[PDB]
Amino acid sequence: LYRKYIEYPVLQKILIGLILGAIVGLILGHYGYAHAVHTYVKPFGDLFVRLLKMLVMPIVFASLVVGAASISPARLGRVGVKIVVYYLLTSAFAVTLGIIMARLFNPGAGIHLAVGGQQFQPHQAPPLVHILLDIVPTNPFGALANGQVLPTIFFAIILGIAITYLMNSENEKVRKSAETLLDAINGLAEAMYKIVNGVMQYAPIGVFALIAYVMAEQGVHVVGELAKVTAAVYVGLTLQILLVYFVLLKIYGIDPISFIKHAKDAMLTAFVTRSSSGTLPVTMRVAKEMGISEGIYSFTLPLGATINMDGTALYQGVCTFFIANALGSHLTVGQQLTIVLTAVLASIGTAGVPGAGAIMLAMVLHSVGLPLTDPNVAAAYAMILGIDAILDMGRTMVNVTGDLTGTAIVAKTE
């Protein structure tokens, strides 16, 4: 009965769906019915993911415009600098943890692989100059038309600042025009939040299908060295959330366990969707219910979804460690690690692409000098691809958790 289903708490529904989907997907993958899953159960998950993508651009644009108009530029710049510093600190912690856990688990140590089979088109990290320029869109409508949250963020910020400057003008009609535009945008944002509530009510079905498909496809592949890689990555995410995020929340006076009861929706939606940008409407909704101001979270969360290096730090460290050992070259000489990190940071250019995990890894390996055309690199990269989605699940989870933690910290500071 529909009324009973809706009346049942969403959090309980989400957990039940996630667990049941995990179990069913694992069973079907073990018994070899993965194709049946990918054919009949997978589409339901994509519907939820597609709904979240649909809400991504409108909600981000409207909420950021409203928040920028609501707060002065001086506060917005301070918030941006603070959240950038927070992301740098958390990224340092995340790379430390990634190195530590990769060394602890020693994945792919001396396990030879067969050359041949699947071979991939190499990938190269976008040039830094191009990425910086793309922050300014040549066409704001085009940026809204096709993804590109980052230039949308810039246009939203400048439009909000212009609107708030206009509202302080001396021409009555100009004030009326600015107020009407801001009210229309605010109405759009609130409508997006209501649609987020509806999509969240639908989510239990979507989360179930997503996790079921992911499990059936790849959880059977989590065995041997790959199992070590997955364990290292997930232990890294847990240590991040427990040492960096929780300690930061406590040091800034935000209770973590109470913060989890709020971030649960964002964390699990990020987990299943495997895309921080895609799950943004839920994360922004969570920040709103947290009481965080519009001008702060509406800027930090969309920004973090593209520059949060916490998840990609652990993923890249652990995987690149696995690739090295798999090739047999235990040595990744010194500054080559710094090259990896710098190329990773430039990998924000692939934000929102479905293959976030593998693509970034391909770019990082190419930057190191291990292009995927190398047959030995091809086998290890294919191995990682065998569990890409499972790793990306947790990567997105930690990324969104860190985005919410930084947003909460900045909101408390301001």
From Swiss-Prot:
GO biological process, one term: chloride transmembrane transport
Binding site for Na(+) 2: T306, T350
UniProt-annotated binding residues for Na(+) 1: G304, N308, N399, D403
Annotated protein name in UniProt: Glutamate transporter homolog
Lineage: Archaea, Methanobacteriati, Methanobacteriota, Thermococci, Thermococcales
Annotated source species: Pyrococcus horikoshii (strain ATCC 700860 / DSM 12428 / JCM 9974 / NBRC 100139 / OT-3)
Source species, domain of life: Archaea
Cellular compartment(s): Cell membrane
Binding-site residues for L-aspartate, renumbered to this chain: R274, S275, S276, T312, V353, D392, N399
Entry keyword annotation includes Transport: yes
Entry function: Sodium-dependent, high-affinity amino acid transporter that mediates aspartate uptake. Has only very low glutamate transport activity. Functions as a symporter that transports one amino acid molecule together with two or three Na(+) ions, resulting in electrogenic transport. Na(+) binding enhances the affinity for aspartate. Mediates Cl(-) flux that is not coupled to amino acid transport; this avoids the accumulation of negative charges due to aspartate and Na(+) symport. In contrast to mammalian homologs, transport does not depend on pH or K(+) ions.
